UniProtKB/Swiss-Prot annotation, chains A, C:
UniProt entry tagged with the keyword Transferase: yes
Record-given protein name: Multifunctional 2-oxoglutarate metabolism enzyme
Regions annotated as coiled coil: 401-429
A GO-annotated cellular component: oxoglutarate dehydrogenase complex
Gene: kgd
Inactivation phenotype: Cells lacking this gene do not show any ODH activity, in contrast to wild-type, demonstrating that this protein is part of a functional ODH complex in mycobacteria.
Family of the protein in this entry: Belongs to the 2-oxoacid dehydrogenase family. Kgd subfamily.
Species: Mycolicibacterium smegmatis (strain ATCC 700084 / mc(2)155) (Mycobacterium smegmatis)
Protein residues bound to Mg(2+): 263, 296, 298
Pathways involved: Carbohydrate metabolism; tricarboxylic acid cycle; succinate from 2-oxoglutarate (transferase route): step 1/2; Carbohydrate metabolism; tricarboxylic acid cycle; succinyl-CoA from 2-oxoglutarate (dehydrogenase route): step 1/1
Control of this protein's activity: Alpha-ketoglutarate dehydrogenase and decarboxylase activities are inhibited by unphosphorylated GarA, and allosterically activated by acetyl-CoA, the main substrate of the TCA cycle. Both the phosphoadenosine and acetyl moieties of acetyl-CoA are important for activation because neither CoA nor the synthetic compound S-(2-acetamidoethyl)-ethanethioate (which mimics the terminal acetyl-phosphopantetheine group of acetyl-CoA) has an activation effect.
Curated annotation (Swiss-Prot), chains B, D:
Subunit composition and interactions: Monomer. Binds via its FHA domain to Kgd, Gdh, and the N-terminal region of PknG.
Residue ranges of domain FHA in the record: 26-75
Signal peptide: none
Gene it is expressed from: garA
Summary of the function given for this chain in its UniProt record: Involved in regulation of glutamate metabolism. Acts as a phosphorylation-dependent molecular switch that modulates the activities of Kgd and Gdh.
Domain of life: Bacteria
Residues of the full protein shown: 51 to 147 of 158
UniProt keyword annotations, A-Z: Phosphoprotein
The protein's name: Glycogen accumulation regulator GarA
Keyword Ligase: no
Species this protein is from: Mycolicibacterium smegmatis (strain ATCC 700084 / mc(2)155) (Mycobacterium smegmatis)
Length: 830, 97, 830, 97
């Protein structure tokens, strides 16, 4: 055949290596697949090895092309990059992977060996000194320590400010000692642990460089990968604070997320896809995450063939076009080199890089597990494997890189590392009294900001009346719920606070009520009225900012991210909004594992606000309830604040108190839908200037009007929008004998204010808890049990008025809903 | 004092710490019985020695894994001068005389 | 430059089209990106157009190569396939996409037009006849109807048995009328809806073929993508029933999943990745899913740039190497052609295919939404777009495919379709009394099955005593919890029932207690002892089967799949097992939206069992509680059965009753960890042969021994493993005045049996509910409120003994745990 | 009966249904006033006609979108014979005489 035919085959052989060489790469330290390892023979023969072929524009022999291709793609590094859509990114990897690599210096090699000495000495101590540390063993994966070191060092070489780590339990205390740099006295203070879940901060100092970098580790539950979006939010909050990245003056993103994973969890957990989906979003990007999968090719007892449907545990990363590097855990030099390349890619393209470190799990999953019961072949191979430290020491002698004296020096150092940890451990034998009210000038300034439009801006004809009605409300009163929320956030911004608000369609609002961002009818340009309050009338900044975004169609990653954002900046006002509260159950792992329990478990505090649209309106069981009963079940003294305000102003004070109380505590708010446009659910200017947050509320006839509380014999305790309906029935039926009291703050129950209020009704003979929600839902399951115990002289005999107990939050029929609703109001007045 | 030297930690977890050189041999390492105890996984059990013979102060590597550096240059043994920087693991010490 | 240089460039130009041509393809019907659309000029010029180049082995001109490449990859179909690792699959797509395509016949074109007529007539009726149908409008996406039709038709052409559809709300009633084939009388029986969530079955008849195929649609919540694993489990259960696929005699997988999606939800929801991860697993594969994304390039008000971090909404499909086809919604012929190719790929390779149909959303997201408020550019373009039916009719006339008479015939047909739906709607003005006990021969047969090993099988030395101890237990008694579970499942198999058991490390058991599958120490071969009970002593099949698998590291997709599997086969015993009950919250959307509420909401029944390892042992807040209180909160009369058995035999009867009661109701079981190896938590042979399920239990001293119930003054009501501890304290402290009663069935509360039992204690002066769980957790929140109401003569004055209320399921310290536990036992006897 | 013909639905949602051909013209379509009302989106409002002139029965397409078929062959008009199959939309009818 022609030289033209042979050339064609070489161009295709070059493409075959770049695309699929990773499949032939020697990445498995155990060499378990005997059928893993000729592509060359496809019209090309031994005769063509010395024939020259054109290459990008030099002319090289086939053997020279093959040696470069084999070294680059078929040794201890499996490169996946031809799936990347950006040609610049493919060319960048191709250039650094296909160049002739200069081997590490003896100094660098000795430094890697000192980190393997430290990693293995730490593990030996752990297994020896304490019982039940098998589940946390990094044995067979110690190369992750010089690899993490190389990541952090490379970040310090770029002059970045911090590396924040998220990881599961395997090798955590090893990471704390050898990466984070925590002393042994702190690591093993009182060992029984909770130490496998706590956060930590330290300073990394470069060995050959001039820079330092902050290194921190975040707190996490046992729930594998749940921390992934939490880390991202935490890093973004830090980036915003340092004026770096998306919301900063530089494009450096100088706070780096380093996310560690297990191979079974990285493939099976959906939050991984959800977090990767945040990587390039304006409201969630962190300039790219460095991911490390400690791929020990097992999940407790489960083989990769039962854990994933793809060649690699990292194939989910192809979702966002991230480059993936599969690296042999027995080659610490290739592991460190890939780590540095990854940081350089993240710096050049502000996008995620995935490192798949192939290794093994030397022990069973936990103390009292013979892993050969379920995987005999794997553990017969592992039982003959020499340790990575001794193998690397053996390699350096073999290659003549280090002398026999130097090997003895390295062995002396190891014993000194072991003696170091054994010796040190042996020797180890308020609320702020601030006013939430604002002046009339503040309310006016926020209303005027809605009309202070940019030059030549065109407002949509349907959005213009909203802007004008807000200037009217600000000066005249009759302020609705949607305006009161912006009055609260805008006035915090004016006071210098960072306010971050986000969720699905949050910019406009699900119910077309917010309009926090307005779109230019002719150019699509955005305008944020509250961003004007970040500047004082004299032009100087307040220090405040309005960061408002539309989220992705996620709950788990979005709620996790917002929780992490509040941990990353305790001074920020962070609010996440559900489309409807009914969808927040998709983020249950975050509510359970982080928001409701993080403080008691880890001492980690969060001031995150969750806005959950709630209310029975006939819109179905997936558009009715934020599951009040579940949040109330999770609650414990000082856990969270749980509220359901009935008034725009009482919600204003609720938010303002939350952002100014100097306490870090999550706030759960059951927000309205149709009550947003209820003409009665409106507030006076005075309610914003001359009042505070009211945890309990009475009818305005008893506080402002001419209402006689002594004629009252039946008292209806309620929360939410049903008050207005009960009150309307009271007005039409002219009933003086009945009064309605609203519990605005559900948790903590306001015992004192509730008592004081009921004492103003001396002739009450029957008390009733009124709710829209079924008997097994709403506030009744908890209130029914706690109210007669907490206040026995006020709630012993407290009966229930509600929808009947159901297996769903509501009926599916809006006609049934209308019938059930009239029944409650008829019983309340029966 | 005249004849005696000083070591000041400028880079490391114990930055600001000072060690007086007033003996014929002054050991530097991770062994807790070291004259200059430099606590880090990068420093070997027995790392360096600061030797005083005659008038000149000398730094000597005594078989460490990560070596000893004088003004960013690796050494087996070196005569020290006022203002020289010695690197022992991640620690950077300033020599004063 | 040389012809060698020019050849090299052509080989690379060919690779550039196959790899990246999809980026230049005319896939957007709105043409919103003005910068979307020369690659040719890279050393190649106008002069080289007529130069011949070698191709796979013919010689073609550059213009001939370019025309094929442009037709195949740059017209109305964007093909993504070069990311597929299997070369056979890449070659298969390349051959069918790069061939010269024969245009449809006039008959086929007229048939597509009749389906657009039906789709548009249906939509016109919907918007006209009823108010508030804007949220469900398929307007701008009607091409999905001939596309779905082509999918189903192609499945019928392969002679398959059924197509099961899962989809969100958009165009559902249109799919029901024009795809599922339900009549208008059923579709609009009583319109107010719940009709957007119900299941349906119909028969599809081919228009040009000889075959019929069953078409069904599954029920789903408003939670987008939650139904994805449910569909997969449902299809797998159907496949297993038809003896097709993975657990069948043929490799046909003749039940096809057709999964529809929205573009924002497909990119943001983590369950999508989790379900794609099931696609090739032994225990979860369905032979490949056909996915359709109705890509209207908007998510309520959110733009794709805020919803995803990748070029396409379908990039998550690259995770499992699925081919992706981006297709212009304005080209119904290309839409139908891609649909048929997809079914052929799924048949050839038993793997998922993703179809990204690019379209638009003609209206706002709901009635009273001006979508130009948030997207003015998109809706200024949409407002000028002609409908797909009229555009296709205009195309066929233009191309001369149909005559003007034929166009009038098509317009006459449309009016007839509109009149058809307007006229039809106008004219529309028990438990089985079965014994759960087995004979001694059955118990012996199951014990003997553990030792009836295959010829030349080598058992692991640590697994051999387990096998022998089970033969001993079967003949001698002292049966532990792990054996009683297998006694229950094995005896159901012997009776002919299909038993499917799965979860993380379920084959062996998390606590090395199950050993349902045993591994050959020398060859890795698997042996399933209970699979021997599928055959009678005479060799004839029983009709029973043991399907036991290790799941992926998923909860959402695994629990969803098992729920769907129980809906797909009501006769199967389906059990999902959590590693620890604490991880089931990752599947909260499935528990809330399907398991606990599917029957009340949709009339859809499930008999799924959830095994949730539960118990306070000092192992942390993520290894202690399955959140009993949350399941009890969700419960309503006839919703679910909730149990926490304390005895191996009482658990045996619980499972046997569940599988033989002839009732489809989910079963939630709080299963043990350390109580599995408790020497006291053992049962007699007689408890399995001469007894039934006991919802309430007394101490064996009062039922078998010489216990005097009249000396009892204090009664301790409990559930779970704490009984044994209380009983041990009673034995050591020799206390006759105290008795312990166990509530084995938590829901439904057994009022009658509980009453009967307490009546046998006439001298009781103080009752106490004893639990390990904090005051706000366990059974107390519900029992504390319901027990004094349900039985006022028995539980009025019932006090609580437990751990204090906490924000987490437990303390993190095992020392605190040990102190708190001794405190409860000390209070119980205080 | 002699001279009169029969149509039997063999494929379609109303399989087993029978229509007697005893008139000069017998309309087949989706219009509810059709002599043979074949209810499906594939059948046009006015689809076909079964005509009896002299002794022979004829099927005639009267402007349907999906056409009329006789023994899998598209026709504008066709003489029918005992055992012939007529396709009107997704329906397959068997002609008996
Ligand atoms: C979300 C959720 N769901 C399930 C589990 C359970 N769970 C764990 C413990 O919690 C339990 C057992 C133990 O005692 O150690 S460890 C584990 C296997 C992890 O496999 P991997 O990712 O490959 O990592 P590796 O261990 O480094 O090889 C599972 C599946 C969980 N933690 N979180
Ligand atoms: C899991 C979860 N989380 C959030 C939602 C909320 N939610 C919906 C309603 O439920 C609410 C609003 C409405 O009134 O219609 S519709 C919607 C947007 C869907 O975007 P898409 O996927 O591109 O589809 P398309 O609509 O065809 O363009 C969202 C985000 C949900 N349903 N489930
Ligand atoms: Ca606060
Ligand atoms: Ca049952
Ligand atoms: Mg693993
Ligand atoms: Mg959409």
């Amino acid at each position: 055949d022609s030289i033209e035919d042979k050339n064609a085959r070489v161009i295709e052989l070059i493409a075959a290596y770049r695309n699929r060489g990773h499949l032939m790469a020697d990445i498995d330290p155990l060499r378990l697949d005997n059928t893993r390892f000729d592509v060359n023979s496809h019209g090309l023969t031994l005769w063509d090895l010395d024939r020259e072929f054109k290459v990008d524009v030099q002319r090289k022999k086939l053997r020279d092309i093959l040696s470069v291709l084999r070294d680059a793609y078929c040794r201890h590094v499996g490169v996946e990059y031809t799936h990347i859509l950006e040609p610049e990114q493919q060319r960048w990897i191709q250039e650094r992977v296909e160049t002739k690599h200069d081997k590490p210096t003896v100094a660098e090699q000795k430094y890697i060996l000192s980190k393997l000495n430290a990693a293995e000495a730490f593990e030996t101590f752990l297994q020896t000194k304490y019982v039940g540390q098998k589940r946390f063993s990094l044995e067979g994966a110690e190369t992750v320590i010089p690899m993490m070191d190389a990541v952090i060092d490379q970040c310090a070489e770029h002059g970045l400010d911090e590396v924040v780590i998220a990881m599961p339990h395997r090798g955590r205390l090893n990471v704390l000692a050898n990466i984070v740099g925590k002393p042994y006295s702190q690591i093993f203070s009182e060992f029984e642990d909770v130490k496998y879940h706590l956060g930590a901060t330290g300073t990394y100092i470069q060995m050959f460089g001039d820079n330092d970098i902050e290194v921190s580790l975040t707190a996490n539950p046992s729930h594998l990968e749940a921390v992934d979006p939490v880390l991202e939010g935490l890093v973004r909050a830090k980036q915003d604070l340092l004026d770096t990245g998306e919301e900063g003056s530089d494009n450096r993103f100088s706070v780096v997320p380093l996310m560690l994973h297990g191979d079974a969890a990285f493939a099976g957990q959906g939050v991984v896809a959800e977090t990767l989906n945040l990587a390039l979003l304006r409201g969630y990007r962190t300039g790219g995450t460095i991911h490390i999968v400690v791929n020990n090719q097992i999940g407790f007892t489960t083989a990769p063939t039962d854990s994933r449907s793809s060649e690699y545990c990292t194939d989910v990363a192809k979702m966002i076009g991230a480059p993936i590097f599969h690296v042999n855990g027995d080659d610490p030099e290739a592991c460190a080199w890939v780590a540095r390349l990854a940081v350089d890619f993240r710096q050049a393209f502000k996008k995620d890089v995935v490192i798949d470190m192939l290794c093994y799990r030397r022990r069973g999953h936990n103390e009292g597990d013979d892993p050969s019961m379920t995987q005999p072949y794997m553990y017969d191979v592992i039982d003959t494997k020499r340790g990575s430290r001794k193998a690397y020491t053996e390699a350096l002698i073999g290659r003549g890189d280090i002398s026999m004296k130097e090997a003895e020096d390295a062995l002396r150092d190891y014993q000194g590392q072991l003696e170091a940890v054994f010796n040190e451990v042996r020797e180890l034998e308020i609320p702020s009294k601030l006013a939430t009210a604002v002046d009339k000038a503040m309310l006016q300034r926020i209303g005027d900001a809605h009309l202070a439009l940019p030059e030549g801006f065109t407002v949509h004809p349907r959005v213009r009346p909203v802007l004008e009605k807000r200037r009217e409300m600000a000066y005249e009163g009759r302020i609705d719920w949607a305006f009161a929320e912006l009055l609260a956030l805008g006035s915090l911004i004016a006071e210098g606070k960072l306010v971050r608000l986000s969720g699905q369609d949050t910019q406009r609002g699900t119910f077309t009520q917010r309009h926090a961002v307005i779109v230019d009818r002719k150019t699509g340009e955005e305008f944020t009225p509250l961003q004007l309050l970040a500047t004082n009338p004299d032009g100087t900044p307040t220090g405040g900012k309005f960061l408002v975004y539309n989220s992705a169609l996620s709950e788990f990653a979005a709620v996790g991210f917002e929780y992490g954002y509040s941990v990353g900046n305790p001074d920020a006002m962070v609010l996440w909004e559900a489309q409807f509260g009914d969808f927040v159950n998709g983020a249950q792992s975050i509510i359970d594992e982080f928001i409701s329990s993080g403080e008691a478990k880890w001492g980690q505090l969060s001031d995150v606000v969750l806005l959950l649209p709630h209310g029975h309106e006939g819109q179905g069981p997936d558009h009715t309830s934020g599951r009040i009963e579940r949040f109330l079940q999770l609650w414990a003294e000082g856990s969270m604040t749980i509220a359901m305000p009935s008034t725009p102003a009482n919600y204003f004070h609720l938010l303002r108190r939350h952002g100014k109380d100097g306490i870090q505590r999550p706030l759960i708010v059951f927000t309205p839908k149709s009550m947003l446009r209820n003409k009665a659910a409106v507030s006076d200017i005075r309610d914003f200037t001359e009042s505070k947050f009211r945890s309990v509320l009475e009818e305005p006839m008893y506080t402002d009007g001419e209402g006689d509380r002594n004629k009252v014999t039946r008292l209806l305790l309620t929360s939410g929008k049903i008050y207005y309906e009960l009150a309307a029935r009271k007005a039409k039926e002219n009933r003086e004998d009945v009064a309605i009291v609203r519990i605005e703050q559900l948790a903590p129950l306001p015992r004192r204010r509730l008592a004081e209020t009921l004492d103003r009704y001396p002739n009450v003979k029957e008390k009733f808890w009124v709710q829209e929600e079924p008997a097994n839902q709403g506030a009744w399951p908890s209130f029914g049990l706690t109210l007669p115990e907490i206040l026995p002289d006020h709630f012993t005999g407290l009966k229930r008025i509600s929808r009947r107990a159901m297996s769903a939050p509501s009926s599916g029929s809006s006609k049934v809903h209308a019938v059930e609703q009239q029944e409650i109001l008829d019983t309340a007045f029966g | 004092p005249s004849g005696s030297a000083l070591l000041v930690v400028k880079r490391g977890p114990n930055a600001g710490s000072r060690f007086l050189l007033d003996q014929p041999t002054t050991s530097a390492g991770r062994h807790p019985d070291s004259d200059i105890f430099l606590d880090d996984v990068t420093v070997s059990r027995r790392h360096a020695e600061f030797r005083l013979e005659g008038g000149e102060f000398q730094v000597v590597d005594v078989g460490s894994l990560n070596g000893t550096y004088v003004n960013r240059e690796p050494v087996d043994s070196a005569v020290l001068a006022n203002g020289d920087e010695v690197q022992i693991g991640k620690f950077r010490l300033v020599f004063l005389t």
